[PDB]
């Protein structure tokens, strides 16, 4: 019954240092050949091997990030720590720590932690500004809301107080170079309903206690 869990600040400034801890149970890093490694994954990309440490206290790092990474272990508390210096927005990703069986089964990372999301931005908690994305026998017209410049994730969008769900597409947000997020939520509806039906997106950014109802029309 092996388990690992990553912990540490979910937010880090564009020049600061990122410190992550991996707490595990069901095995000891004092055993033979056992290892604990770190793997990162930016929301838009593949897995990237970072580093690993073994019972011998032996350590191996990603060549490319060798001068920015430091990995240590503490037998007494069954934890492994990863320190990444000089972080930048490109380092925002989900970081996982995993277990590697000792000497066969050594050729893999058999158990993984849930992973922790780390965002790198110099941004402060900011509510979004909600703008309209206006529409205009035949049917199906598109309309939506632009939820711009907020931080940090997440935000929720509903339409007509949840009364409208069919045809709705809320896209994952994108982190802008400004360090602020921006996402759009759209819904397809019959063109004929534009003149009578009313459409409003209900935006809620909990982190900033910001709620906005935006009525959208041609």
């Amino acid at each position: 019954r092996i388990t690992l869990k990553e912990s540490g600040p979910p937010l880090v400034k564009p020049t600061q240092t990122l410190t992550l801890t991996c707490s595990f149970s069901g095995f000891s890093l004092s055993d033979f050949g056992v290892g604990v490694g770190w793997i990162r994954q930016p929301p838009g990309k593949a897995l990237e091997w970072l580093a690993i440490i073994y019972s011998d206290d032996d350590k191996r790092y990603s060549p490319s990030l060798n001068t920015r990474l430091t990995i240590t272990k503490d037998t007494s508390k069954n934890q492994v720590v990863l320190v990444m210096t000089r972080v930048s927005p490109v380092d925002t990703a989900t970081y996982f720590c995993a277990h590697r069986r000792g000497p066969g089964p050594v050729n893999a990372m058999d158990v993984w932690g849930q992973g922790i999301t780390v965002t790198i931005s110099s941004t402060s908690t900011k509510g979004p500004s909600v703008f309209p994305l206006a529409p205009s026998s035949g049917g199906t017209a598109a309309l939506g809301c632009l939820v711009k410049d907020y931080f940090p994730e997440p935000v929720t969008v509903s339409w007509n107080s949840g009364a409208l769900t069919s045809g709705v597409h809320t896209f994952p947000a994108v982190l802008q170079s400004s360090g602020l997020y921006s996402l759009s939520s759209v819904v397809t509806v019959p063109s004929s309903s534009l003149g009578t039906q009313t459409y409003t997106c209900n935006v809620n950014h909990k982190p900033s206690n910001t709620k906005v109802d935006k009525r959208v029309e041609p």
Partner: protein, 213 residues
Amino acid sequence: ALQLTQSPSSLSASVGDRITITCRASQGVTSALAWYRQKPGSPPQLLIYDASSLESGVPSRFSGSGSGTEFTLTISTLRPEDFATYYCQQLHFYPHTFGGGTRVDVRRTVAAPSVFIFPPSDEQLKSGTASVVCLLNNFYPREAKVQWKVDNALQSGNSQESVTEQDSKDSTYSLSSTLTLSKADYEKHKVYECEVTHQGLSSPVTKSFNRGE
């Protein structure tokens, strides 16, 4: 540096299909290769270790084979939970690199996107920035190309896009692309064009609007 290349990068299949994916290493890695399946929002899950060993608790569907630089993962009868991304990883040479992954999605008939273009709101213009958005609704396959133009000028570096997860009932995707310009740039030009390329379109379709008209 050792390179692990996965092919095909993307694959569309159906439940009950038999698929085989590959991972090639630029240098011999003996049998030190592992395969993982990753469902969105979850961590990777070990399927095969030591190139051909089936991890305990992993369904008989999966099997792997290979050695040296050639490796494959095969699923006999794809199951609904198999629609995910798979990665290979070599642990013979440090650093223990991962492949670029192979995305397996639900196959359905080709569907061209419904394209819509949205001008920036007068409300936003007051902020000093103009966001113009192009929506590509319910299309398939996932691969799609959006090109922005302002007065016939190709825009590059000033747009961002995001795509939704494959629709559970429709099997289609939708994409949103936003072109960001300063209020000044926006007022300085008239025609805003969103050109979309997609297998379902015999030719690229362009949706546009004139800031004035």
